[PDB]
Amino acid sequence: LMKNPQQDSGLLSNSIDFRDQNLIFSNSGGVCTSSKDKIENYPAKGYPYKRGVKLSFGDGTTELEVEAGGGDDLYGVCSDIDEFSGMATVIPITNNFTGYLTLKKVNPGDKLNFNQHGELEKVKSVNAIALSKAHKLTEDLFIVLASVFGNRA
């Protein structure tokens, strides 16, 4: 529910090994980021972190926001959140993305698509290919390295 752990640790983290130190929920962004990427920011409704986002409209008094979702309403992928300002970083579905995303509670090369809650799941209309296996961070939290490169036919 938070980008960073809510409860502080009581142990100093030992920095000796250099392998498998990126499988954390605080790893925001993408593993391979291009300097020509298009990045937007939106007001955040809920916690769409590491989830596909869709546009949400209110009565009209306030501006539009982004909320977790997929399917036919998919608009982009949320890769970072600034919690103080409630800002969600969005990479549009028209821009190629490669990074870790939330997986629904799966081998590399399997086709993936976004569900109603913005969680990747094994398969229709979204070009998503898994790059690794599911990594468990919490009892109900699973992540997966995937590449999203637009919408198929």
């Binding site: 298009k38 546009l55 209309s125």
Partner: protein, 152 residues
């Protein structure tokens, strides 16, 4: 055409700062990124603020107002002297004011570019979302804020 404000009889009062951006002469988008791909192409007609499709005949291919399954891009600026149009490719996303078929366009409405390059309510080929309602700037012109992100 594009900028008809050159014909005027009196100086405008530059005091109010609200409801001052919804105009036909506004060229570009409401929000623009530094890494947006823009292509200049010859045009035949008036494809300003409209969906543009490629036409190949000899001469180089030219873009003209259109849509449907032939949609190639969206025109956001036009240069009359050089007879050129700046286009954002359909691969790239856009957000700005575009011409609609009529005034029956509201918020949360899914829009489609027609064969005349105008946006009309709805399957669908592209992802166009109307963020506002159509504004009657002219008798026949209806500007509406629309966010376009790829094709369905």
């Amino acid at each position: 055409m594009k900028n008809p404000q050159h014909d005027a009889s009196l100086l405008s009062n530059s005091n109010e700062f609200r409801d001052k951006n919804v105009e036909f002469f506004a060229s570009g988008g409401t929000r623009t990124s530094k890494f947006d791909k823009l292509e200049n192409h010859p045009f035949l007609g008036y494809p300003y603020k409209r969906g543009v499709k490629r036409v190949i005949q000899h001469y180089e291919p030219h873009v003209e107002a259109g849509g449907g399954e032939d949609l190639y891009g969206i025109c956001i600026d036009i240069d009359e002297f050089s007879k050129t149009a700046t286009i954002v490719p359909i691969t790239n996303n856009f957000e700005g004011y575009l011409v609609a078929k009529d005034s029956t366009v509201k918020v949360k409405d899914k829009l489609i570019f027609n064969k005349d390059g105008a946006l009309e309510k709805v399957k669908a080929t592209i992802n166009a979302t109307a963020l506002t309602d159509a504004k009657q700037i002219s008798n026949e012109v209806y500007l509406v804020k629309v966010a376009v992100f790829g094709n369905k």
